[PDB]
């Protein structure tokens, strides 16, 4: 932790940039900032001021007031995660269901760390060995969605959440955050393209990495309510379809427990 903090090199923005260039990337802007309250908040604020955030990438070394979903938090220490948000214009034509972007983002994270090391837990989680390796948050601000990823690279669970894990804690020796980050951006770009095009590979690939689909689950709803059943599928809006004795309960978000 003290030990870890002293062995976490900064990102090399110029090298991230070079990788996007060499690759002919369609990302329109890439910035790394030392610290911010929330990258998601930052891109939403740009959009709100009339900036075109489509294809804008914002990476923060440190994030001091991270957002989870529905009012929960996201914790970090400096240089220990890849903390990034991207803008996506969603009002195209033929309009696709923006609820799939968060799923596409998880998928891209898992594909980016596959070379080094389990799967996607709906709605927001990337798990490895049952621990939370990454969290995904998509926020709509028509005509945009801001899509956020917190990926634990060397972050220790004692620094952020007892149920967290990281690439380092999974046994990856000296993870190269630059190379992972560049790979992540390549895969996010690829999945957003599939999403726009209504390409079926997206949902097929998500299924192939899904921990939730096919599981006995409890869906937990406000008011201490719950519904227990089988996570039958994810629908074309990105929502979980729970089979309860033949009847379908479709939930758009919120908490899901694998039993």
Ligand X SMILES: Nc1ncnc2c1ncn2[C@@H]1O[C@H](COP(=O)(O)OC(=O)CCCC[C@@H]2SC[C@@H]3NC(=O)N[C@@H]32)[C@@H](O)[C@H]1O
Binding site for ligand X (CB under 6 A): 38-40, 66-69, 72-76, 83-85, 124, 132, 135-137, 148-150, 152, 155, 160-161, 164
CB of 143 to ligand X, least distance (A): 20
Output 70 or 197, the one with its CB closest to ligand X: 70
Output 200 or 219, the one with its CB closest to ligand X: 219
CB of 78 to ligand X, least distance (A): 13
Give the C-alpha separation, 258 to 236, whole Å: 22
Residue 227 token pair: 């519904």
Output 39 or 154, the one with its CB closest to ligand X: 39
Output 158 or 243, the one with its CB closest to ligand X: 158
Residue 190 token pair: 């690829």
Gaps in the chain (C–N > 2.5 Å) come after which residues? 117
CB of 245 to ligand X, least distance (A): 28
Give the C-alpha separation, 255 to 47, whole Å: 29
Give the C-alpha separation, 175 to 116, whole Å: 8
Residue 90 token pair: 């969603």
CB of 18 to ligand X, least distance (A): 23
Q: Are 33 and 13 in contact (CB under 8 A)?
A: no
């Amino acid at each position: 932790m003290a030990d870890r903090d002293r062995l976490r090199p900064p990102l090399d923005e110029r090298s991230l940039r070079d990788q996007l260039i060499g690759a002919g990337s369609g990302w329109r802007q890439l910035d790394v900032v030392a610290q911010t309250g929330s990258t998601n908040a930052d891109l939403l604020a740009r959009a709100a001021s009339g900036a075109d955030i489509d294809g804008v990438v914002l990476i923060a070394e440190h994030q001091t007031a991270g957002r989870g979903r529905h009012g929960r938090g996201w914790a970090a220490t400096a240089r220990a995660q890849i903390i990034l948000s991207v803008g996506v214009r969603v009002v195209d034509v033929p309009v696709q269901a923006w609820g799939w972007l968060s799923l596409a983002a998880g998928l891209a994270v898992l594909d980016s760390v596959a070379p080094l090391i389990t799967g996607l837990k709906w709605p927001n989680d990337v798990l490895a060995r049952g621990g939370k390796l990454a969290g995904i948050l998509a926020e709509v601000a028509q005509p945009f969605v801001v899509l956020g990823v917190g990926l634990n690279v060397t972050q220790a669970p004692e620094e952020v959440d007892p149920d967290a894990t990281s690439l380092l804690d999974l046994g990856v020796a000296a993870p190269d955050r630059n190379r992972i980050a560049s790979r992540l951006l390549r895969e996010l770009e690829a999945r957003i393209i599939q999403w726009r095009n209504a390409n079926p590979q997206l949902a097929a690939d998500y299924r192939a990495r899904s921990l939730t689909i096919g599981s006995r689950v409890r869906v937990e709803l406000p008011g201490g309510q719950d519904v227990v059943g089988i996570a039958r599928d994810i629908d074309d809006q990105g929502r979980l379809c729970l089979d309860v004795g033949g009847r379908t309960v479709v939930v758009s978000a919120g908490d899901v427990v694998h039993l």
